[PDB]
């Protein structure tokens, strides 16, 4: 039932913020947390991820979370930033510089205990707690070095709820800071350990579909986390609203992840289209699944058509025949079988919520486990070991008190991890 | 986990308490050697010059002795 979410560092408060706008809307609640909604489908569900405070208010379950106090302004001065508990913001002075042993080991061990406090106040105001969601990026200090330490704290304390989290892997297309293959590959390691669903956000992927799809020639974070909140609406669609699925966070874990380290989600999200004759257009349910399952509308850089899917969900939205979206998602494993490995019968699973997302008539959201996620990993793994073959760079984090030792494990669990990727998309049956 | 967080954190603490050593006391010693160098080659200068007004007292008892004759 209940959901505590977690947003740590600027990119994790600044999706996470937007998480909450969008679904806010969805549910009817305004700013001020009243609810002005019609259908009483928007309060059927809303307890898993508000809190019902006096007067009829709904308060996001939601803490906040970093290590220098620019974003929690920035959020609390927003939309919707009135609407958060203020006792739920919890943030330093010091700021992490980019570095995950700063906020892993040095400066986040001070504030650490603090989030652990709000994260158990709100735990013990919920009917049945089903676990804990987490907004972050990999490739800088907050979000991945403590974000990881609050990840591997929570799991101690309650070591039977899901641990989810929405991470956002860097680019070299996006971002300038060098050091960033450094603090990912030492987030994934802690996360193919931790967490028991991860939603891979590749910000090389949100670029090439801003620049090349969608052809925004000065692409913005604003571009690029409207489309983390549209996916990140869609993924959770069959947790806030009722109907035909009688579903939460665990069984989506049994049903997606067929091997414990073999957890991490290629989403996507429909429909895409470049402004704006196309954007009048009739979105047919054809349309939307052949888009759906486009190589080019993956949100993780990563070419699907280069390995095999080990489980797929798919969510539509909106007025639709279930009929049609039966017929056509048949179509695609029936026509391209190849692609869905056939030692797990009946792999690709589809739910539709009758709600669509605001502006739209139609939309589906892709969730794919596939072999050719390796992609991502091996991208990251080059760019570190480049720099980790002559220690460049090794300074910022052995200042902190890492050994080497540290990174090497690291990567050495990474590679792993490829190459159990890669047994899969050979295995037959 | 927890032991090698606190492992981490000790050892960031524990080189720069390190490097504050060091510092602290490279200086003190260099401090320490300039000075007596630099009053070695002062008390070297002076005992020399001392050493000409001792000859010169010498050059006048010297001319005292030639005096007497
Ligand atoms: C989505 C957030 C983003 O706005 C995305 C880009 C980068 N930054 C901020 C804004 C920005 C951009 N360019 C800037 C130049 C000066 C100051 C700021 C910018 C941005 C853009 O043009 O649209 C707003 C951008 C940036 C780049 C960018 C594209 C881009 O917008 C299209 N490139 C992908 C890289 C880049 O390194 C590259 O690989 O070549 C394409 C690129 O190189 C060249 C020769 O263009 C370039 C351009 C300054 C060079 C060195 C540093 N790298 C980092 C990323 C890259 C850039 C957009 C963050
Ligand atoms: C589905 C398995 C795995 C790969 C395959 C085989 C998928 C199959 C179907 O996916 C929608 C494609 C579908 O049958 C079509 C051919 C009608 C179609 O939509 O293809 C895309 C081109 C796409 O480029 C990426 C293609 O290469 C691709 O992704 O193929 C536009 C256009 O091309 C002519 C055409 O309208 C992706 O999950
Ligand atoms: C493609 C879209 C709609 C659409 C497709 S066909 C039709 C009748 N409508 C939606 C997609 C929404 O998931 C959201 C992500 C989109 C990002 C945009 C905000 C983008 O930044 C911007 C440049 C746009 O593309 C428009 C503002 C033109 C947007 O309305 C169209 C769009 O992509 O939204
Ligand atoms: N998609 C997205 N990525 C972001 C955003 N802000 C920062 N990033 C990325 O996050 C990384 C830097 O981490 P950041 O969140 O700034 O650092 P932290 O505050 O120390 O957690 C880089 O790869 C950035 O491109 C954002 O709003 N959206
Ligand atoms: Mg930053």
Same mark, same amino acid.
């Given at each position: +039932?209940?959901?505590?979410?977690?947003?740590?560092?600027?990119?994790?408060?600044?999706?996470?913020?937007?998480?909450? @706008?969008?679904?806010?809307? @969805?549910?009817?609640?305004?700013? $001020?947390?009243?609810?002005?909604?019609?259908?009483?489908?928007?309060?059927? +569900?809303?307890?898993?991820?508000?809190?019902?405070?006096?007067?009829?208010?709904?308060?996001?379950?939601?803490?906040?979370?970093?290590?220098?106090?620019?974003? /929690?302004?920035?959020? =609390?001065?927003?939309?919707?930033?009135?609407?958060? %508990?203020?006792?739920? #913001?919890?943030?330093?002075?010091?700021?992490?510089?980019?570095?995950?042993? !700063?906020?892993?080991?040095?400066?986040?061990? *001070?504030?650490?205990?603090?989030?652990?406090?709000?994260?158990?106040?709100?735990?013990?105001?919920?009917?049945?707690?089903?676990?804990?969601?987490?907004?972050?990026?990999?490739?800088?200090?907050?979000?991945?070095?403590?974000?990881?330490?609050?990840?591997?704290?929570? %799991?101690? @304390?309650?070591?039977?709820?899901?641990?989810?989290?929405?991470?956002? &892997?860097?680019?070299?297309?996006?971002?300038?800071?060098?050091?960033?293959?450094?603090?990912?590959?030492?987030?994934?390691?802690?996360?193919?350990?931790?967490?028991?669903?991860?939603?891979?956000?590749?910000?090389?992927?949100?670029?090439?579909?801003?620049?090349?799809?969608?052809?925004?020639?000065?692409?913005?974070?604003?571009?690029?986390?409207?489309?983390?909140?549209?996916?990140?609406?869609?993924?959770?669609?069959?947790?806030?609203?009722?109907?035909?699925?009688?579903?939460?966070?665990?069984?989506?874990?049994?049903?997606?992840?067929?091997?414990? =380290?073999?957890?991490?989600?290629?989403?996507? #999200?429909?429909?895409?289209?470049? %402004?704006?004759?196309?954007?009048?257009?009739?979105? $047919?349910?054809? *349309?939307?699944?052949?888009?759906?399952?486009?190589? !080019?509308?993956?949100?993780?850089?990563?070419?699907? %058509?280069?390995?095999?899917?080990?489980?797929?969900?798919?969510?539509?939205?909106? =007025? /639709?025949? /279930?009929?049609?979206?039966?017929?056509? /998602?048949?179509?695609?494993?029936?026509?391209?079988?190849?692609?869905?490995?056939?030692?797990?019968?009946?792999?690709?699973?589809?739910?539709?919520?009758?709600?669509?997302?605001?502006?739209?008539?139609?939309?589906?959201? #892709?969730?794919?486990?596939?072999?050719?996620?390796?992609?991502?990993?091996? =991208?990251?793994? @080059?760019?570190?070991?480049?720099?980790?073959?002559?220690?460049?760079?090794?300074?910022?984090?052995?200042?902190?008190? &890492?050994?080497?030792?540290?990174?090497?494990?690291?990567?050495?669990? &990474?590679?792993?991890?490829?190459?159990?990727?890669?047994?899969?998309?050979?295995?037959?049956? | 986990?927890?032991?090698?967080?606190?492992?981490?954190?000790?050892?960031?603490?524990?080189?720069?308490?390190?490097?504050?050593?060091?510092?602290?006391?490279?200086?003190?010693?260099?401090?320490?050697?300039?000075?007596?160098?630099?009053?070695?080659?002062?008390?070297?200068?002076?005992?020399?010059?001392?050493?000409?007004?001792?000859?010169?007292?010498?050059?006048?008892?010297?001319?005292?002795?030639?005096?007497?004759?």
């Amino acid at each position: +039932r209940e959901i505590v979410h977690i947003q740590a560092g600027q990119c994790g408060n600044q999706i996470g913020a937007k998480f909450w @706008e969008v679904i806010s809307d @969805e549910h009817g609640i305004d700013p $001020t947390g009243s609810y002005h909604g019609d259908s009483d489908l928007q309060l059927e +569900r809303i307890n898993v991820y508000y809190n019902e405070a006096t007067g009829n208010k709904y308060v996001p379950r939601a803490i906040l979370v970093d290590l220098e106090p620019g974003t /929690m302004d920035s959020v =609390r001065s927003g939309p919707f930033g009135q609407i958060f %508990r203020p006792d739920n #913001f919890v943030f330093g002075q010091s700021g992490a510089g980019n570095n995950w042993a !700063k906020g892993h080991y040095t400066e986040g061990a *001070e504030l650490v205990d603090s989030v652990l406090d709000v994260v158990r106040k709100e735990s013990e105001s919920c009917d049945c707690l089903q676990g804990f969601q987490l907004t972050h990026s990999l490739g800088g200090g907050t979000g991945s070095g403590m974000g990881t330490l609050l990840i591997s704290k929570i %799991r101690e @304390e309650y070591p039977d709820r899901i641990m989810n989290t929405f991470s956002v &892997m860097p680019s070299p297309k996006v971002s300038d800071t060098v050091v960033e293959p450094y603090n990912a590959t030492l987030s994934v390691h802690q996360l193919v350990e931790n967490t028991d669903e991860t939603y891979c956000i590749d910000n090389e992927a949100l670029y090439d579909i801003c620049f090349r799809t969608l052809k925004l020639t000065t692409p913005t974070y604003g571009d690029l986390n409207h489309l983390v909140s549209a996916t990140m609406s869609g993924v959770t669609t069959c947790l806030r609203f009722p109907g035909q699925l009688n579903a939460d966070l665990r069984k989506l874990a049994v049903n997606m992840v067929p091997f414990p =380290r073999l957890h991490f989600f290629m989403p996507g #999200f429909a429909p895409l289209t470049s %402004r704006g004759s196309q954007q009048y257009r009739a979105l $047919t349910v054809p *349309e939307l699944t052949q888009q759906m399952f486009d190589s !080019k509308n993956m949100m993780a850089a990563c070419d699907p %058509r280069h390995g095999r899917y080990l489980t797929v969900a798919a969510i539509f939205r909106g =007025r /639709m025949s /279930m009929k049609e979206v039966d017929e056509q /998602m048949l179509n695609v494993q029936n026509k391209n079988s190849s692609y869905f490995v056939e030692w797990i019968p009946n792999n690709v699973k589809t739910a539709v919520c009758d709600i669509p997302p605001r502006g739209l008539k139609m939309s589906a959201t #892709f969730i794919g486990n596939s072999t050719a996620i390796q992609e991502l990993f091996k =991208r990251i793994s @080059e760019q570190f070991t480049a720099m980790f073959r002559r220690k460049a760079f090794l300074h910022w984090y052995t200042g902190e008190g &890492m050994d080497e030792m540290e990174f090497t494990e690291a990567e050495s669990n &990474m590679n792993d991890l490829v190459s159990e990727y890669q047994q899969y998309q050979d295995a037959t049956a | 986990k927890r032991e090698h967080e606190r492992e981490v954190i000790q050892k960031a603490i524990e080189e720069n308490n390190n490097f504050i050593k060091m510092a602290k006391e490279k200086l003190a010693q260099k401090m320490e050697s300039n000075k007596e160098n630099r009053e070695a080659h002062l008390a070297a200068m002076l005992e020399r010059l001392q050493e000409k007004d001792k000859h010169a007292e010498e050059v006048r008892k010297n001319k005292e002795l030639k005096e007497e004759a």
